Design a protein around this ligand. Structure first.
Ligand SMILES: [Mg+2]
Ligand SMILES: [Mg+2]
Lengths: 301, 301
């Protein structure tokens, strides 16, 4: 029995029309909104300087004309500025396809859609959850920097991620559009400390609710664990602390199963499934959010 | 260690611009290409007739004006015809955003991208593999029929799927654009026989190659199973028969591990992983194709 859950991204058309190529001296991608093009600042870096760039000096060394911005058109750069790990290039033409948009920061456990681009050309789209250590388990190769991640509310696109780098363990991280890197990461090509990943408890709860909604409830018992007790346990067992939301409450109402019943189940399941399966898995799944389950299974948006 | 594999869909913009709403008497989605709108023929069915429709009589009962086609514009229908399980509506305006396209049929184990739409509005995109029983493990609700699936080669979109129905086990099926349903399914709301699903052997091989490409090769031994011997075994063990491709051969060259080594490994792993993991899983994975692995990990397209 199939759960009806898939990794679901937003339609990407609105964002495709915002992607450009930026070249200064490698070539990466930029995001063109109104009269601004955003791109990673390491576009300025010579290849032999990627491990210890002096970005302040590099910025000083460029003129507006140093930055070549092309859409697959040529956009003339008339201003340049650095904000954190991003460049803000002012161009002479306002993107006529600029969507309604905001900038936001995504929180661990929350999902967003990524448009992977190479040489300014959209090539694929996928969805990821921001991990508790501020990496994403993405799919990015050389030339993908400047690819963007976003959520969407109504017609408004909320840009939350600009791709910067791959870590030694194969995961990925990037910047918010305030120019801060997610986590403690730096946009320099050196090995860096990585925080531990953790299971996202709220998303595990969501997935167990998805199981119940599909007739799979063998793991539900009358036993309950309080949120306070679970969160103490979580800190010793590589789980995030659980913070309930209205979305989780809607699943509890629809199924008649209390959150505290599933927090108890998680504690037991973490010790082992004992050969049993849940929605075809023998391990906890934390890559689907409460919102995913509400929307995809219940049609509640 | 993250494999760098995600469920990757094509960018959806080209197809978003082709989606319309079709209403005749429920409302579902259509695909507008040139002067033609394609949609499921059960748009003609009254709700009390979905279990045993007489589609030939329904078609006879409609005029061009019976079909209301709207883009979120109104497209005037000037001709109507039925081909298999699809309607072909001729409209008076050619879609100015028609991409270069073909129609194709997808084969079991092959991946395609789906644009899920409701009321003519694109709402999400995801990727699925066609299962050996001609279902897909999708995410579709009431109102999604007429949503389309496609592959893409260069700039050309190859449309391969138009959504029709959900089966009792939660999976999905639909039509090719020749109007044939995939598999033995009929577009009638009655319980129907479902063929067994099977593991897609070529995709399991691809995933084991992805593991090797990520430094995970504990399951590789000198032992080999021939393709002929494996395929005899597959028929008794709910696997597809294996048919190698150039894409698989590229993975064998890059890793230095022969296909026959991985066919032996599959036979052993199918008896159990013995507590060991491969790319974070304790079961065989068949949802990634050889092409996925070549493109996402090796950048070979
Ligand atoms: Mg379902
Ligand atoms: Mg990798």
């Amino acid at each position: 029995h199939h759960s009806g859950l898939v990794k679901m991204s937003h339609p990407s058309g609105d964002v495709e029309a915002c992607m450009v190529q930026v070249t200064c001296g490698m070539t990466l991608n930029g995001l063109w909104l109104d009269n601004t093009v955003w791109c990673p600042r390491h576009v300025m870096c010579p290849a032999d300087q990627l491990s210890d760039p002096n970005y302040d000096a590099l910025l000083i060394s460029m003129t507006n004309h140093s930055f070549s911005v092309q859409k697959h058109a040529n956009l003339r750069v008339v201003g340049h500025a650095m904000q954190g790990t991003l460049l803000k290039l002012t161009v002479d033409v306002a993107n006529p396809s600029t969507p309604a948009y905001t900038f936001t920061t995504v929180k661990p456990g929350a999902a967003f859609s990524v448009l992977a681009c190479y040489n300014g050309r959209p090539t694929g789209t996928f969805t990821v959850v921001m991990r508790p250590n501020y990496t994403i388990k993405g799919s990015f190769l050389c030339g993908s920097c400047g690819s963007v991640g976003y959520t969407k509310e109504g017609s408004v696109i909320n840009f939350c991620y600009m791709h910067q780098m791959e870590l030694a363990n194969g995961t990925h991280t990037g910047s918010a559009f305030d120019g801060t890197m997610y986590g403690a990461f730096m946009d320099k090509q050196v090995h860096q400390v990585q925080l531990t990943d953790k299971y996202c408890s709220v998303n595990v709860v969501a997935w167990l609710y998805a199981a119940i909604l599909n007739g799979c409830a063998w793991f539900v018992k009358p036993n309950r664990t309080s949120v306070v007790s679970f969160n103490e346990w979580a800190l010793a067992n590589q789980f995030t602390e659980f913070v309930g939301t209205q979305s989780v409450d809607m699943l509890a109402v629809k199924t008649g199963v209390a959150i505290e019943q599933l927090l108890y189940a998680i504690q037991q399941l973490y010790t082992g499934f004992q050969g049993k399966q849940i929605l075809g898995s023998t391990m906890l799944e934390d890559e689907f959010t409460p919102e995913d389950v509400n929307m995809q299974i219940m049609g509640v948006v």
